[PDB]
Design an enzyme around this catalytic site. Structure first.
Site, PDB file in Angstrom:
ATOM      1  N   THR A   1       0.853  -1.223   0.000  1.00  0.00           N
ATOM      2  CA  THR A   1       0.000   0.000   0.000  1.00  0.00           C
ATOM      3  C   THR A   1       0.870   1.248   0.000  1.00  0.00           C
ATOM      4  OG1 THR A   1      -1.829  -1.068   1.209  1.00  0.00           O
ATOM      5  CG2 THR A   1      -1.740   1.360   1.251  1.00  0.00           C
ATOM      6  N   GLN A   2       0.579   2.163  -0.919  1.00  0.00           N
ATOM      7  CA  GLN A   2       1.251   3.453  -0.959  1.00  0.00           C
ATOM      8  C   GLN A   2       0.235   4.538  -1.288  1.00  0.00           C
ATOM      9  OE1 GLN A   2       0.937   1.452  -3.546  1.00  0.00           O
ATOM     10  NE2 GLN A   2       2.871   1.162  -4.658  1.00  0.00           N
ATOM     11  N   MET A 107      -1.157  -6.666  -2.291  1.00  0.00           N
ATOM     12  CA  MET A 107      -1.423  -5.404  -1.591  1.00  0.00           C
ATOM     13  C   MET A 107      -0.304  -4.378  -1.802  1.00  0.00           C
ATOM     14  SD  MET A 107      -4.433  -5.685  -0.278  1.00  0.00           S
ATOM     15  CE  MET A 107      -4.573  -4.437   1.002  1.00  0.00           C
TER      16      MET A 107
ATOM     17  N   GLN G   1      -5.679   4.667   2.309  1.00  0.00           N
ATOM     18  CA  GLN G   1      -5.469   3.190   2.391  1.00  0.00           C
ATOM     19  C   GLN G   1      -5.921   2.520   1.096  1.00  0.00           C
ATOM     20  OE1 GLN G   1      -4.069   1.232   5.100  1.00  0.00           O
ATOM     21  NE2 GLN G   1      -4.075  -0.236   3.397  1.00  0.00           N
TER      22      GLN G   1
END
Ligand SMILES: [Mg+2]
Ligand SMILES: [Mg+2]
Ligand SMILES: [Mg+2]
Ligand SMILES: [Mg+2]
Ligand SMILES: [Mg+2]
Lengths: 233, 195, 125, 196, 204, 226, 222, 212, 195, 196
Positions: A1-2, A107, G1
């Site tokens: 995740t970024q 992810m 997110q």
């Protein structure tokens, strides 16, 4: 995740009778800061494919290197690398789509929306979309980001279904694309006046146009607009 | 508080209410009467948040007693239950709502009929042959759905009520310390002192 | 300051008369004649435009006033009292009816609302 | 938004872009951000459009009522009324206003009222999201007692750069000139200022 | 937690040839627990019918409120309120609680006594009027009702054909909703006769 | 929702789609979004439908009383000022996004107003979920000195773009034309490009299909004489 | 997110006949209030007379269909070109789905075909692999609009024989392929009217002993 | 959901409802909530549908491997413990399971184990699991005897699910009955609750609160 | 689970453990034996999180039985309790700790002494004359502090235990469905079948 | 931080302020932000001091090992190594690096690597918190093929303005000149640049 840092806005495209057109502006935004003004976001692969990329620019540059490596790899032990065993638009897309979906499944996505535009060996038009989620779809017109909301409605007035494609010339298609780019420049706060446009035709091949500008802009009517309601002066 | 049950039989309404008062860790009392007589032929049992239950019940009682004196007349169970519903419906949109659920068991002397009304803290009123609040219905309604008859005697109602309490004592995790049972009929309100 | 007249200025006299109402009716009696006639397919209301001066533009003084699209009013007596009553009547047709039922009030009910306002000026402090 | 007001020899000039955004969507590309609160007292608005419009309307009302009683208000007085509204309602407002006006006694004056509701009298002021990118340029290029033409060029060049770098700024550059001679509106289109 | 789906229930209304129909289930529950199978959700004030779904305390409160208001209306107007007028009254009354609303889905049905025109209308919890020509749906199985009505409905149905259409729309919609059912009522409304029919349906 | 407003030679035109939705469900397929503030001041609403209706009727009511008080025909700037001050006071909680258009003794006017109370002036405007689709069309085909016929065409084309491309918009195009020195003409269902095709089957049931427990006559009549 | 999931809308419908099965789905692909494509096929011929659709999040849907098609290929390699029966395919799909129990394919899967007796078969799956053979199953956005209609018009629920008044049910007579297709078309026409994510086109795959046939129908594009 | 299983003189009765819901939406009325692990063992579905289906089919595979290796029928104790030990390995990961593993062997007799996704394994005579479990317990507890006939035991299980189906919004559709003997389970049909309710109401005189 | 008590008298250790197993809303069982025999003269009762209690108890049982076979020798209660403590102390810093509290009642055949060890899920061990886990001590320890004598007979221990259970049944809100009582002495482990 | 690198006729010059802050406290007022990764390949660091020091040390190691095997690396190669570290570890790094170097074949080159780890070859680059205030000034004043003295003046004036407006920037202006002639360090004190 970024999170995306340096970003590119809309990529727009459509099919016409003999091929496909794809376009994207030359801006690399840094939030609301219009930081980089000479970013090429259309990346040709061979003479039959152009990959248009929006979203995170660092990930775009990574994808650009993957495509460059793909061409090198395809040429290995391949006497027909420039003929029957050259990379097809469909091969390039499927590869990218695989990578995108794999990356989202770990992810750790490539924060992009991608449109692969090209012409197949048999002359068929290829136009398909893939994004950071690995979601893919095809349509006579395709656009990312703001383009999806503003370009598609305009481009769909030219090619509304599959049967409109053979009736659409390259001049009409390019005209529609160029107008859509002007509309996006009016209305997208993260767009620039400078853009690139690529035509992949089954007869005339790949025509890559750089340093295009939005022109014929209407601003004169602004002089009469005063205040926000009651102000006359 | 916890378990309150009601059953309307042929000629009376029977209300059963648990005796336990639990303040978190300890059972402070095992003989608590969770009911108020609103008028000679109208009884209201209650359960909900501590303090608010008794405060609401006594407030209702005071109001019905005031009406009884002013008009020299006992309001019908239906009229009392409507008054109570409105008070709770008013309360639910207040700054701090009454967290109180009630059963109103009354004998209508005009119609010569027992009547049981179930009202929750939102002001949700229903007239029922038998009712409950909280989890009490979850354990008892399958028994009441099976055995209940509209022509049951008071004694048969009490026997069906015993079966309901036995099932509660078996499957409920909490010890509610038995129930106080009261009967509302044409002669008024009386407590069954052995249950 | 503050309105310290919180008591009625109209009261019953020993004979049962409400003096201020009688005197208001006397003021009406001095007023210019106005009339109304009801037909089968309409009603007409009429009055004289008694111009106070020939230099005055009597078209700018409306004695006959639209209250709703289907209700009109005319008067006899004190013009200024009429003018404010028309303002109140127009507003009450909206606040106590049109904003509730989405339609203009029937004649009798608007009349009832105007009547209520006039009654209150007969009893209020 | 990119807004500025600059005092010069003959008075003061207000400048602004015309872009109003909702996120990345340009909801209005021809916005007029130069607002008249009195004949020769104008303001540049930044922040919440609802707030700055509401404030400006109230100020215009206050100065209209002031004028009816006490004659023409000073620019300082106008700035004070703006400040009173911005300071006292600071919890519920997002407004950054530059007030510019011309008196005959005081000549050109500029007051900036940032988020908190403080007042700062300055020779020139810059505000809005785009102003960040031209602090360097404006500080290096501003001179006192410039001519009308020089001040127009200074504002045109400044806002050109603000527009170039700030995505929230764009469209036309509007200007309002306040002098003894009267009130003059100017407009400059993209094809003009983008080539500067 | 969601106030509009604590008690459950549905209402549907339809127009036919010189007639209207309004129907509702009979369930009142506390989430999963069924509490009452006799909780009717359709009321009438003169010849105007009002169905109300949603939070049951508000259903009861609004019925009492509109009985209150239509009674005063009648005393002052010297006539029964009409469906068109009542629809505006419902809308006005709901919007006055704009920031503390009744959690309901009202449905008006009736025939104008002077024009003879069939009328139906629906509202969201805060007063927005949906005046459909064909049908109005409301409640915890409104999606199901939309599906049933959209396929089953055809215009200008005779009263006894409209009964079958609206009944089957309600029944099959309710059987795909956990919080609806436990009996059903259908009103068939004509200019000067109204017939009320209780339907037989599964009791789970 | 797609709503547009377009200025032309001697007036202004507003248009809207006719779909109202509750999430992904279409509540009404032929919704009326063009609201009358006064005979020649109309507006179109997007956002919370009850709010757009209520704020229009309230200001419309006060505009009517103002018109009667002043013996003058209502002005668009008055409707605008009253709307924005009302909406600003409620700090966006009244979710009314409106395009306000009209003609009055001052001329023809076109404004937009947002729920927070901010207003804007323009020759062409669009609001709602389909505003980007509509604005794309407006930005492509708008010009100065449009005729009445050209403005109606442009306005309805802009709504169509919303109808076809925005899932929040659909069904029909409503138009209202306000021309100086004329009655405002409200063109309800100006376009109808979404009629449902005939179904494959009739679903009319045989009579007696539904099981019935009880029947009874409902007394809708008042208490009777004698 | 980062949200790994999305919703591409769409509605699918599987109906099992006496000696046939249909699996239908609309051809509209969406995100939020935008249309991605008016024609993006969603129901696929997977070989061995099996048709499949995995509706919901299209990336997971495409991945699952792709892996199942692959499973059919390897079933032939590993088991002497044996035909994968519809029940065997169903169990296999359960394991594909449950393999990602703790990071599920965000889809509602339906497959259709014929069982080993030649009778029509439809299997329905939840996102994590619980499955059942069914006669009638709608999936996706407008499933709640379609299923009650099918209960009424396919299974004749709440329908009784006139004159008996609730005593005798309407008998469950078998429907032809032409009859089923009528109900499918009316289901989607009705769903298109009342659901914003349903429209553009309807593609139906019909499975018989003769093989897999396709039918396409226009739906409203608003 | 409502599932029950009880031990009696003639073996085990397993009775379940058929409803599956997603929120208020009734997804299915035809769910098979009894998993036929093998011809001798039954499991009930409650909690997660997939978790119960998948792992109880898997259990069937483990039971089959056991009897191939040991040349003897697996005990209900051993079978239930294979499942409970498995789900205990996954504890914390989010499995959802509440099941009764039912069997009838020589050494044990009729045996029921309640197995649960937080690792609980309970042997017992009567178990009930689901959103309508409290309603079914009432009918069970007041009518249960060890010396029930197979016919009366079957009816009791049916009647107890009906009680739950009536009151619990998330229970209904139809009732599936099973009778587990030493020689294997016997299926006793699918019973639509709609039709069953009216039938029971008339024949039994129960549900006087409901108009029929 | 809920209440587990232990008392070490003159010549034996007595463990009392509740019979209820409650899964949220319903009491699923009222005859549950919350104990495992680790060796002929060592008994362990347990309470804590569902599943983990029995899993841990049976794991310990298997390990002690393995030791018994390997060495042909019964470990002392002290040795067993140390082994158990280490397992729990190891567990508390694991990925997912055993949420299990135990009492270990054993008769040391070498020393001819009863021994009671209390160990919580953290690995906190104490040797006590009487012990408990959870809230059980809060109700019972004041009675045990008063009446306990180190020279009590088994019968006197049981009588004091009855008084403790009676106080629990009076003041505890939960119905724990009575207790199973087991005695550990020189002759091994036996269950008191009437309590 | 205010950092920049500017190509000119004879090569490239790197510029930086010397202020390092922990909140509002100046932890170091004489910081050297111009770091050597190879003889004529330097970089300007912005972001986390720990991160950019760690990255630079690793790059210096990589280029030292490169040189031992393959001879002098190009500026592009150095930028690529920086990018590889910044891109692959983007989740765990806060680094904004400008890479500047002199080849004899390629002459002066500048590469900027912003937060994401993308690479952008530019005639000149500006970065750090202070850079926001000089986008306007730098764009207006930069010319290609300036002389050494002009480029020093351009950087001095630019960073002067960045320091003036940015509280996170200050101290001395350090510069490193990269040409064929070699490596020259320059320093300019507050009393010099503040009066510009
Ligand atoms: Mg605000
Ligand atoms: Mg800009
Ligand atoms: Mg139902
Ligand atoms: Mg649709
Ligand atoms: Mg049920």
């Amino acid at each position: 995740t970024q999170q995306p840092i340096v970003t590119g806005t809309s990529v727009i495209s459509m099919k016409y009778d003999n091929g496909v057109i794809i376009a994207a502006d030359n801006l690399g935004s840094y939030g609301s800061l219009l930081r980089f003004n000479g970013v090429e976001r259309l990346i040709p692969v061979g003479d039959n494919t152009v990959v248009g990329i929006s979203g995170d620019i660092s990930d775009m540059q990574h994808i650009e290197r993957l495509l460059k490596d793909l061409v090198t790899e395809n040429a290995y032990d391949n006497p027909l690398a420039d003929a029957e065993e050259a990379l097809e638009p469909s091969y390039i897309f499927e590869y990218l789509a695989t990578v995108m979906y794999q990356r989202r499944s770990k992810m750790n996505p490539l924060w992009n929306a991608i449109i692969v535009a090209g012409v197949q060996s048999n002359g068929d038009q290829f136009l398909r979309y893939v994004n950071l989620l690995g979601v893919t779809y095809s349509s006579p017109t395709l656009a990312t980001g703001f383009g999806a909301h503003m370009a598609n409605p305009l481009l769909r007035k030219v090619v509304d279904r599959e049967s409109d494609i053979p009736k659409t010339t390259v001049q009409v298609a390019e005209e529609a694309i160029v107008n859509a780019m002007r509309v996006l420049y009016y209305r997208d706060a993260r767009s620039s006046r400078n853009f690139s446009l690529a035509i992949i035709d089954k007869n005339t091949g790949l025509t890559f146009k750089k340093n295009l500008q939005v022109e014929n802009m209407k601003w004169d009517f602004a002089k009469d607009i005063k205040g926000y309601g009651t102000q006359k002066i | 508080m916890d378990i309150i049950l009601g059953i309307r039989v042929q000629d009376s309404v029977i209300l059963a209410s648990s005796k336990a008062v639990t303040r978190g860790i300890s059972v402070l009392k095992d003989s608590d009467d969770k009911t108020r007589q609103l008028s000679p032929h109208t009884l209201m049992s209650f359960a909900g948040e501590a303090g608010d239950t008794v405060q609401f019940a006594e407030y209702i009682q005071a109001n019905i007693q005031l009406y009884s004196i002013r008009e020299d007349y006992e309001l019908s169970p239906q009229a009392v239950s409507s008054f109570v519903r409105q008070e709770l419906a008013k309360s639910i949109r207040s700054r701090r709502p009454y967290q109180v659920n009630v059963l109103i068991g009354g004998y209508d002397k005009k119609k010569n009929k027992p009547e049981l009304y179930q009202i929750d803290y939102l002001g949700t009123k229903v007239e029922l042959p038998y009712g409950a609040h909280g989890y009490s219905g979850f354990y008892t309604f399958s028994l009441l759905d099976h055995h209940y008859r509209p022509d049951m005697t008071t004694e048969e109602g009490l026997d069906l009520l015993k079966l309901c309490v036995q099932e509660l004592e078996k499957r409920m995790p909490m010890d509610f310390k038995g129930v106080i049972v009261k009967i509302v009929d044409k002669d008024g309100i009386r407590q069954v002192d052995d249950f | 300051m503050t309105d310290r007249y919180s008591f009625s200025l109209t009261t019953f006299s020993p004979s049962g008369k409400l003096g201020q109402i009688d005197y208001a009716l006397t003021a009406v009696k001095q007023g210019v004649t106005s009339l109304g006639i009801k037909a089968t397919n309409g009603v007409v209301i009429a009055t004289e435009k008694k111009s106070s001066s020939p230099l005055a533009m009597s078209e700018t003084l409306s004695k006959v006033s639209l209250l709703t699209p289907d209700i009109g009013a005319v008067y006899s007596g004190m013009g200024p009292d009429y003018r404010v009553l028309v303002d109140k009547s127009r507003k009450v047709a909206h606040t106590s009816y049109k904003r509730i039922y989405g339609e203009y009030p029937p004649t009798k009910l608007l009349v009832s609302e105007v009547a209520k306002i006039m009654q209150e000026a007969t009893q209020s402090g | 938004t990119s807004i500025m007001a600059v005092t010069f020899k003959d008075g003061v000039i207000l400048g602004a872009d015309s872009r109003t955004t909702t996120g990345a969507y340009i909801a209005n590309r021809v916005t007029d951000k130069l607002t008249r609160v009195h004949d020769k007292i104008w303001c540049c608005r930044s922040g919440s459009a609802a707030d700055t419009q509401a404030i400006a309307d109230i100020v215009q009302y206050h100065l209209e009522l002031y004028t009816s009683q006490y004659g023409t208000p000073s620019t300082e007085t106008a700035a004070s009324v703006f400040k009173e509204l911005c300071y006292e309602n600071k919890d519920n407002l997002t407004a950054g206003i530059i007030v510019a006006g011309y008196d005959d006694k005081n000549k050109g004056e500029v007051y900036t009222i940032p988020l908190g509701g403080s007042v700062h009298k300055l020779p020139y002021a810059i505000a809005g999201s785009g102003s960040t990118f031209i602090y360097g340029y404006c500080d290096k290029n501003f001179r006192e007692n410039m001519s009308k033409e020089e001040t127009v060029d200074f504002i045109k060049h400044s806002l050109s750069q603000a527009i170039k770098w700030d995505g929230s700024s764009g469209g036309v550059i509007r200007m309002v000139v306040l002098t003894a001679a009267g009130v003059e509106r100017l407009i400059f289109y993209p094809d003009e200022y983008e080539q500067l | 937690s969601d106030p509009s789906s604590i008690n459950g229930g549905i209402v549907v209304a339809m127009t036919g040839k010189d007639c209207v129909a309004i129907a509702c289930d009979l369930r009142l529950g506390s989430q999963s627990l069924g509490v009452s199978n006799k909780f009717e959700k359709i009321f009438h004030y003169g010849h105007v019918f009002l169905g109300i779904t949603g939070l049951a305390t508000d259903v009861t409160t609004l019925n009492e409120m509109f009985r209150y208001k239509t009674n005063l209306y009648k005393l002052k107007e010297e006539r029964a309120i009409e469906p068109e007028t009542f629809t505006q009254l419902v809308s006005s009354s709901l919007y006055e609680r704009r920031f503390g609303p009744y959690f309901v889905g009202p449905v008006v049905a009736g025939i104008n006594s002077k024009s003879g025109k069939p009328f139906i209308a629906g509202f969201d919890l805060i007063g927005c009027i949906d005046e459909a020509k064909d049908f109005i749906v409301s409640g915890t199985a409104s999606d199901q009702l939309f599906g049933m009505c959209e396929s089953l409905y055809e215009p200008n149905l005779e009263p006894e054909d409209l009964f079958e259409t609206i009944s089957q729309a309600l029944l099959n919609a309710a059987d795909r909703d956990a919080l609806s059912g436990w009996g059903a009522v259908v009103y068939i409304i004509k200019k000067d006769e109204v017939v009320k029919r209780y339907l037989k349906m599964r009791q789970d | 929702t797609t709503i547009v407003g377009v200025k032309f030679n001697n007036g202004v035109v507003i248009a809207a789609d006719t779909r109202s939705t509750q999430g992904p469900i279409v509540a009404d397929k032929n919704c009326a979004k063009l609201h009358r503030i006064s005979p020649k001041i109309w507006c179109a609403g997007a956002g919370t439908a009850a709010d757009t209706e209520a704020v229009t009727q309230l200001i419309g009511s006060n505009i009517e009383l103002h018109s009667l008080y002043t013996s003058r025909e209502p002005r668009v700037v008055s409707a605008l000022q009253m709307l924005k001050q009302h909406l600003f006071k409620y700090q966006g909680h009244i979710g009314a996004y409106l395009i306000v258009a009209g003609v009055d003794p001052t001329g023809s006017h076109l404004f937009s107003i947002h729920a927070d109370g901010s207003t804007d002036v323009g020759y062409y405007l669009s609001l709602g979920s389909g505003s980007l689709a509509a604005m794309a069309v407006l930005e492509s085909h708008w010009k100065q000195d449009l005729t009445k016929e050209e403005a109606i065409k442009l306005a309805s084309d802009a709504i169509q773009a919303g109808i076809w491309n925005d899932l929040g918009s659909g069904s029909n195009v409503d138009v209202c034309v306000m021309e100086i020195g004329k009655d405002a003409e409200y063109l309800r269902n100006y376009l109808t490009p979404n009629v449902r095709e005939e179904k494959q089957k009739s679903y009319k049931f045989p009579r007696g299909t539904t099981a019935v427990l009880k029947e009874s006559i409902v007394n809708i009549c008042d208490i009777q004489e004698e | 997110q980062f949200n790994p999931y999305g919703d591409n809308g769409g509605t699918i419908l599987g109906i099992a006949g006496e000696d046939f099965a249909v699996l239908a789905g609309d051809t509209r692909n969406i995100t939020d209030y935008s249309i991605n494509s008016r024609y993006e096929p969603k129901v696929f011929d997977c070989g061995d007379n099996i048709v499949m659709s995995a509706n919901g999040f299209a990336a997971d849907g495409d991945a699952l269909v792709k892996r199942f098609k692959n499973s059919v290929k390897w079933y032939h390699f590993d088991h002497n070109d044996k035909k994968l029966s519809i029940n065997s395919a169903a169990r296999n799909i359960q394991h594909l789905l449950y393999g990602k129990r703790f990071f599920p394919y965000y889809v509602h899967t339906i497959i259709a075909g014929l069982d080993e007796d030649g009778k029509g078969a439809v299997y329905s799956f939840d996102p994590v692999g619980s499955y059942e053979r069914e006669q009638c199953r709608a999936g996706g956005a407008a499933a709640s609009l379609i299923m009650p209609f099918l209960d009424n018009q396919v299974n004749f629920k709440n329908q009784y024989e006139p004159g008996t008044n609730g005593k005798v049910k309407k008998p469950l007579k078998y429907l032809s392929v032409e009859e089923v297709i009528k109900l499918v078309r009316d289901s989607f026409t009705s769903a298109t009217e009342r659901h914003i994510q349903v429209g553009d086109g309807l593609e139906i795959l019909i499975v018989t002993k003769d093989g897999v046939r396709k039918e396409f129908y226009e739906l409203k594009r608003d | 959901t409502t599932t029950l299983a009880f031990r009696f003189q003639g073996g085990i009765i397993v009775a379940v409802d058929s409803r599956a819901t997603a929120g208020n939406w009734v997804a299915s009325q035809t769910v098979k909530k009894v998993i036929e692990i093998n011809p001798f063992l039954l499991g009930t579905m409650a909690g997660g549908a997939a978790d119960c289906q998948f792992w109880e089919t898997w259990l069937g595979s483990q039971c089959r491997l056991h009897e191939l290796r040991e040349k003897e029928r697996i005990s209900v104790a051993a079978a239930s413990k294979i499942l409970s030990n498995l789900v205990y390995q996954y504890k914390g990961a989010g499995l959802s399971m509440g099941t009764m593993i039912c069997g009838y062997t020589r050494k044990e007799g009729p045996t029921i184990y309640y197995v649960d996704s937080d690792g609980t394994r309970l042997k017992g005579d009567i178990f009930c699991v689901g959103s309508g479990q409290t309603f079914a317990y009432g009918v069970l507890d007041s009518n249960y005897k060890w010396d029930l006939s197979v016919e009366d035991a079957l009816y009791l299980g049916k009647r107890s699910i009906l009680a739950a189906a009536h009151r619990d919004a998330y229970s209904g559709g139809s009732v599936n009955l099973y009778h587990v003997t030493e020689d294997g389970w016997i299926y006793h049909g699918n019973h639509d609750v709609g039709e069953l309710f009216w039938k029971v109401k008339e024949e039994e005189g129960s549900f006087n609160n409901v108009i029929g």
